[PDB]
Design a protein around this ligand. Structure first.
Ligand SMILES: *[C@H]1O[C@H](CO)[C@H](O)[C@H](O[C@@H]2O[C@H](CO)[C@H](O)[C@H](O)[C@H]2O)[C@H]1NC(C)=O
Ligand SMILES: [Zn+2]
Lengths: 883, 5
């Protein structure tokens, strides 16, 4: 076998770290490179700064100009908040300098103190020696910024430029006789970034002044890239107003500029294994089983420093740049290979106390993954994420072609293939139209690596790769240390449009795509066979507008325990009992699926638009993660949302979470007070259906009719009966307060509607009708539609506030229930302590409807409506009619 | 103008 020294030398040219295991050896090499770079920077900066004033204040209307490759580029002015206000470039052997504002117009005023240091910078630009005079009348070409202001700027610094009187950016012969090229964002050119890089490499020295305040500049971004620099994030220096004060010493400035982008102290710590044993872990707090340590002193600053390395490397991942195909990238390459070597040695699980050195180095190496390369290495141990099935997944030797629908203007969607660990994958987009695309790997949210919990650092921190930009009809080569599910990220797309995806070298995880109204009998049998082969650790299910990214063993667990091995019924109930139930309850336009007859009739009798795709279009993809861990708790809300028990079509948590992404403010009582209440109609309706379809009684005690009754009879005794019942029921700001008592309000109307239609099966239609009503209120043309919607008295469309101190949800619910029931429902709103605005009371008044006297529906069960008892509440409060 | 926070 070769030596690790021979392995590392060969890995440095190609990127093939497969056989690279000696991370201390790679770390010694990095240490040698970092010290060389720091010595070179400290010579250059000492010459530039001398002992002149460092004072430099670019103001709020300016931009940050950052280095990129640490071996070619470095800061010039770092502010006291650590923002890089100007950067030096030596890209491609040239000399360049970039300012985040037009410092040349400020040398006679707000930045007079910077003028001598700028003189030295130009002298370094023009001659490569900060202490060598420029020649009298040296030729300066000024492009993209006012020539007179720029030249007088240089004259204010004590230089004596002469106007080159030609464009050294676009005119090659001007460039060979100009001594300096000053650039701003007014430039014009074809291939603006390549041209800049070429003048720089031919030896034209370039000074760049950002001319657009705190705005970004597309032209400035291209100029910066040509110099091997990059523009700061959106907003620039507006908030921070960073600057360099007079108090700044040269020594301090030299120290920061020597270290920037190569964290020397971290390299020393990695070489020496001198990781901390004294973190005060007692300062960690738990929250629904999720330990975090943001208050352990020192930890946040250690985390921030590692984030910086991750940001620097991921910038190349996101641009689809392969550092191993770029010249002069030794430092970056070393960082990436060291991390690849650490990944060979990782063993799980680790503990933040019992295993500090392995924990802390792993924490660093997890943040340094280079994804754009022709070869790389698999991490040996994949811990709680995956195992031997993922490692040994077979890959396709030939190019596969997939057609993908992008259902919305922006999002991501599962491609249906996986990167295998350490196996080169090549991907290509075609037929994109106007959509902008990127490929990504996996969908884990970062909270689901529970590395702060005792002995739970058992998987990588960053299983979801950064989004890797794809340009149409240009292949990109990927190697992932982990393997992962391939996502396509898109923006500016046309809903319903297709994309073509070509990919070579990818694995095929079990994949099921069903679309409403088509023949899936083949796709399902394909999917069962893949499940039975037991070749993969991860799978995906696309069904309608729902994408499930799931650990195989979690789903087979749910199919064995709750469905007895019957995959077919599992899929039917996933589609029909869970997904369709919710989206039908919410009255979305489901393809090939008409509205039920009693909904169609109500909508027609009211002259409502209940079918147009513009008002009732299905929302975008809802994503679900089924994993060993969650962002927060055992399950966390969002898109994707997380769950850890498995996947149960009849499960309460499944419909609760989907319900959250279907909440609308105008159907919430007291705003956030109903934040964990109004989405509950989806699990509630599912359970009522499950008891009547299948005879299974799930969660029969969730709706606390008895206790809501108790809080109601008490509050209504007060001298303000509304404000009375309110403070018992809705005042409590606890995010799960009175949760089963507040649900009793929402189901009140189901029982009421069921009676009103004289049909026990129609009660839930009221929420569908309110959902249809709500979307018309939200989106329809106001003047033309407010009449039919029961909003005729409103000059303007009502508000959509979610605040608990708003009436907007109370109002809409009162109006919608009153319009739909054709009864004034203010007595029952007051009985529940629901205060509505005078405009909404004005509107209900104008209906000229018979008052519905305050009522209450009581029951001793949640799911069985046949035992429900109606109480007249208008003349006092009757007794609880059970037993 | 101002950037949106
Ligand atoms: C703040 O609102 C702004 C509208 O006035 C704007 O949408 C901004 O979003 C930024 O727009 C930039 C181009 O002008 C870039 O696209 C940038 O990435 C993007 O953030 C809003 N900023 C945020 C994110 O709150
Ligand atoms: Zn919730």
């Amino acid at each position: 076998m070769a030596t690790q020294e021979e392995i590392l030398d060969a890995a440095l040219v190609s990127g093939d770290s497969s056989q690279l295991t000696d991370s201390h050896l790679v770390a010694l090499r990095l240490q040698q490179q970092v010290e060389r770079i720091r010595q070179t920077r400290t010579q250059l900066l000492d010459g530039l700064y001398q002992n002149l004033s460092q004072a430099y204040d670019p103001g709020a209307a300016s931009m940050w100009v950052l280095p990129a490759n640490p071996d070619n580029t470095l800061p010039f002015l770092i502010g006291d908040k650590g923002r890089v206000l100007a950067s030096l470039s030596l890209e491609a052997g040239g000399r360049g300098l970039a300012y985040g504002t037009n410092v040349l117009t400020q040398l006679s005023g707000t930045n007079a103190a910077h003028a001598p240091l700028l003189k030295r910078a130009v002298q370094w630009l023009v001659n490569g020696d900060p202490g060598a005079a420029t020649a009298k009348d040296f030729k300066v070409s000024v492009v993209g910024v006012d020539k007179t202001a720029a030249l007088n700027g240089l004259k204010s610094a004590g230089l004596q430029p002469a106007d080159a009187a030609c464009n050294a950016l676009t005119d090659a012969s001007c460039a060979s006789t100009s001594k300096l090229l000053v650039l701003g964002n007014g430039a014009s050119a074809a291939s603006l970034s390549a041209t800049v890089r070429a003048r720089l490499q031919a030896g034209l020295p370039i000074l760049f002044v950002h001319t657009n305040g705190w705005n970004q500049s597309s032209t400035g971004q291209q100029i910066l890239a040509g110099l091997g620099l990059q523009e700061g994030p959106y907003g620039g220096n507006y908030w921070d107003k960073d600057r360099v004060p007079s108090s700044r010493t040269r020594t301090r400035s030299v120290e920061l500029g020597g270290a920037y982008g190569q964290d020397p102290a971290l390299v020393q710590q990695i070489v020496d294994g001198s990781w901390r044993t004294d973190y005060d872990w007692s300062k960690c707090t738990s929250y629904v089983g999720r330990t975090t340590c943001d208050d352990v002193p020192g930890l946040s600053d250690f985390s921030k420093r590692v984030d910086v390395l991750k940001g620097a490397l991921d910038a190349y991942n996101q641009k689809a740049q392969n550092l191993f195909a770029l010249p002069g990238t030794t430092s970056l390459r070393l960082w990436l290979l060291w991390a690849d070597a650490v990944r060979q040695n990782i063993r799980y699980p680790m503990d933040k106390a019992a295993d500090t050195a392995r924990f802390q180095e792993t924490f660093v190496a997890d943040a340094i993954v280079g994804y754009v390369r022709e070869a790389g290495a698999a991490q040996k141990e994949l811990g709680s994420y995956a195992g031997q099935r993922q490692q040994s997944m077979p890959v396709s030797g030939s190019e596969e072609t997939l057609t993908l629908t992008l259902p919305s203007a922006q999002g991501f969607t599962a491609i249906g293939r996986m990167a295998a660990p350490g196996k080169r994958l090549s991907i290509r987009i075609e037929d994109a139209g106007q959509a902008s695309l990127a490929v990504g790997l996996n969908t884990q949210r970062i909270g689901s690596t529970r590395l702060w919990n005792t002995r739970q650092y058992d998987r990588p921190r960053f299983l979801k790769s950064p989004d890797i930009k794809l340009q149409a009809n240009q292949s990109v080569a990927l190697v992932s240390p982990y393997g992962g599910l391939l996502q396509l990220v898109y923006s500016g797309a046309t809903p319903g449009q297709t994309v073509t995806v070509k990919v070579t070298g990818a694995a095929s995880q079990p994949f099921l795509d069903i679309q409403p109204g088509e023949d899936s009998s083949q796709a399902i049998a394909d999917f069962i066979q893949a499940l039975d082969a037991d070749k993969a650790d991860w799978l995906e299910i696309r069904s309608g507008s729902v994408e499930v990214h799931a650990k195989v063993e979690k789903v087979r667990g749910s199919i064995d325990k709750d469905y007895g091995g019957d995959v077919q019924r599992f899929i039917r109930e996933l589609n029909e009992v869970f997904i369709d139930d919710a989206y039908t309850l919410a009255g979305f336009a489901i393809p090939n699926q008409a509205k039920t007859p009693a909904i169609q009739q109500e909508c027609a009798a009211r002259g409502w638009d209940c079918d147009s795709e513009t008002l009732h279009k299905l929302p975008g993809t809802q994503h679900i993660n089924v994993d060993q861990y969650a962002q927060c708790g055992g399950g966390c809300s969002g898109n994707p949302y997380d769950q850890t028990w498995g996947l149960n079509p009849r499960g309460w948590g499944e419909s609760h979470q989907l319900g959250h992404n279907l909440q609308v403010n105008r159907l919430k009582v007291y705003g956030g007070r109903s934040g964990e209440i109004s989405n509950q109609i989806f699990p509630l309706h599912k359970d009522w259906r499950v008891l009547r379809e299948f005879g299974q009684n799930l969660d029969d005690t969730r709706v606390n009719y008895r206790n809501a009754y108790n809080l109601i009879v008490a509050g209504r005794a007060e001298a303000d009966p509304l404000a009375g019942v309110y403070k018992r029921l809705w005042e409590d700001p606890g995010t799960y307060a009175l949760n089963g008592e507040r649900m009793a309000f929402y189901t009140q109307w189901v029982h009421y509607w069921a009676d009103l239609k004289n049909d026990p099966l129609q009660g839930w239609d009221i929420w569908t009708l309110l959902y249809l009503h709500q979307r018309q209120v939200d989106k329809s043309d106001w003047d033309a539609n407010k009449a039919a919607l029961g909003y005729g008295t409103y000059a303007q469309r009502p508000g959509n506030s979610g605040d608990a101190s708003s009436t907007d949800g109370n109002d809409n619910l009162l109006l919608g229930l009153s319009w739909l029931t054709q009864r004034d429902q203010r007595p029952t709103f007051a009985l529940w302590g629901i205060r509505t605005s005078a405009a909404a009371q004005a509107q209900v008044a104008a209906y000229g409807f018979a008052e519905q006297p305050a009522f209450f529906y009581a029951n001793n069960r949640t799911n069985e409506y046949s035992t429900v008892k109606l109480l007249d509440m208008s003349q006092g409060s009757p007794a609880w009619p059970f037993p | 103008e101002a950037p949106s926070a």
